[PDB]
Design a protein around this motif. Sequence first.
Motif, PDB file in Angstrom:
ATOM      1  N   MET A  48       0.813  -1.216   0.000  1.00  7.70           N
ATOM      2  CA  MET A  48       0.000   0.000   0.000  1.00  7.70           C
ATOM      3  C   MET A  48       0.855   1.279   0.000  1.00  7.70           C
ATOM      4  SD  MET A  48      -2.906   1.591  -0.070  1.00  7.70           S
ATOM      5  CE  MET A  48      -4.668   1.325  -0.315  1.00  7.70           C
TER       6      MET A  48
ATOM      7  N   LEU B 275       1.105   5.626  -1.869  1.00  9.00           N
ATOM      8  CA  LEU B 275       0.521   6.754  -2.594  1.00  9.00           C
ATOM      9  C   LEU B 275       1.104   6.677  -3.994  1.00  9.00           C
ATOM     10  CD1 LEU B 275       0.856   9.860  -0.218  1.00  9.00           C
ATOM     11  CD2 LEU B 275      -0.812   8.113  -0.179  1.00  9.00           C
ATOM     12  N   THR B 276       0.337   7.070  -5.011  1.00  5.48           N
ATOM     13  CA  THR B 276       0.805   7.071  -6.394  1.00  5.48           C
ATOM     14  C   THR B 276       1.763   8.270  -6.573  1.00  5.48           C
ATOM     15  OG1 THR B 276      -0.954   8.481  -7.237  1.00  5.48           O
ATOM     16  CG2 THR B 276      -1.444   6.118  -7.091  1.00  5.48           C
TER      17      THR B 276
ATOM     18  N   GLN C 264      -0.302  11.476  -6.068  1.00 10.98           N
ATOM     19  CA  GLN C 264      -0.786  11.702  -4.716  1.00 10.98           C
ATOM     20  C   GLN C 264       0.373  12.171  -3.850  1.00 10.98           C
ATOM     21  OE1 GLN C 264      -2.597   7.795  -4.066  1.00 10.98           O
ATOM     22  NE2 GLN C 264      -4.615   8.744  -3.939  1.00 10.98           N
TER      23      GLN C 264
ATOM     24  N   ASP D 114      -9.270  11.371  -0.555  1.00  4.30           N
ATOM     25  CA  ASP D 114      -8.703  10.128  -1.095  1.00  4.30           C
ATOM     26  C   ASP D 114      -7.280   9.882  -0.557  1.00  4.30           C
ATOM     27  OD1 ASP D 114     -11.073   9.761  -2.572  1.00  4.30           O
ATOM     28  OD2 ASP D 114     -10.100   9.703  -4.540  1.00  4.30           O
TER      29      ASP D 114
ATOM     30  N   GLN E  80      -7.564   9.155   3.301  1.00  3.39           N
ATOM     31  CA  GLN E  80      -8.041   7.779   3.557  1.00  3.39           C
ATOM     32  C   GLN E  80      -6.949   6.734   3.297  1.00  3.39           C
ATOM     33  OE1 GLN E  80      -9.408   5.000   1.251  1.00  3.39           O
ATOM     34  NE2 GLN E  80     -11.274   4.355   2.297  1.00  3.39           N
ATOM     35  N   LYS E  81      -6.110   6.948   2.268  1.00  2.00           N
ATOM     36  CA  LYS E  81      -5.017   6.029   1.910  1.00  2.00           C
ATOM     37  C   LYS E  81      -3.918   6.049   2.968  1.00  2.00           C
ATOM     38  CE  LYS E  81      -3.632   4.498  -2.395  1.00  2.00           C
ATOM     39  NZ  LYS E  81      -3.267   4.808  -3.804  1.00  2.00           N
TER      40      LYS E  81
ATOM     41  N   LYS F 256      -5.071   3.948   5.840  1.00  2.00           N
ATOM     42  CA  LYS F 256      -4.878   2.531   5.480  1.00  2.00           C
ATOM     43  C   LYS F 256      -3.407   2.089   5.585  1.00  2.00           C
ATOM     44  CE  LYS F 256      -8.705   1.850   2.150  1.00  2.00           C
ATOM     45  NZ  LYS F 256      -9.512   0.703   2.633  1.00  2.00           N
ATOM     46  N   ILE F 257      -2.472   2.980   5.204  1.00  2.00           N
ATOM     47  CA  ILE F 257      -1.024   2.745   5.210  1.00  2.00           C
ATOM     48  C   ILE F 257      -0.427   2.752   6.626  1.00  2.00           C
ATOM     49  CG2 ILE F 257       1.215   3.879   4.517  1.00  2.00           C
ATOM     50  CD1 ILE F 257      -0.309   4.625   1.808  1.00  2.00           C
TER      51      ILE F 257
END
Lengths: 224, 13
Positions: free
Chosen positions: A1, A3-4, A7, A171, A174-175, A178-179
């Motif tokens: 997991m 970030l792109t 992001q 977004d 939230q990521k 999760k990370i």
Amino acid sequence: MELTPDQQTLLHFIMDSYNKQRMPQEITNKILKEAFSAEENFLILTEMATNHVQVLVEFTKKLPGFQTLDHEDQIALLKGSAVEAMFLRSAEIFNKKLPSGHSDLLEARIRNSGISDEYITPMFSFYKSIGELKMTQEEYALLTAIVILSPDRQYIKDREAVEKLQEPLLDVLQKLCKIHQPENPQHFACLLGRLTELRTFNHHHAEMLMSWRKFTPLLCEIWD
Amino acid sequence: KDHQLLRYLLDKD
């Protein structure tokens, strides 16, 4: 997991504008030096609110896409979010930036600044509630940007354009939950709980100003 | 509607 790269870039621009912000030493020295009277305590809080307004506009100007919004919508967002963005920053200064004794003197001054307990009680309640989350600098920065880029403020002429700027930040937030908190699935929900709690301060704040006769013309122009 | 201070702060350099 992870970030792109996109992001990561969006987050970096937010963290940069956020880390620039600093409460001046001159204000900090007043908390420590000035007389402990309602007059002086209220004046320090007035100096703090004015400095937050300047810090808020500088932070906002550097949010990606903010400068691309219609000019009157930029004013409407700044005016709509100033009270909420203040309490959020103040929670950070109180719980993280100020030395333990300094925040104790600040609280002392806040409780002896002629302000009713009606407003004082939810304020410290919110400070304790926020401190419980053990918020990272990224969560404070993202949460502040989401409060500012809220598309449901009054007098906004193009809401979809603001929605387009706010959705990628939620977004990203939230990521990050999760990370960094994979064992705590409700971490994001907890952070959203603060957005709703911040909104109540708009009403608390508006009524508080009506019990003034303590009158600060500069702040009243910003607030209502 | 006028919000003069916010306008100056926003439109500054």
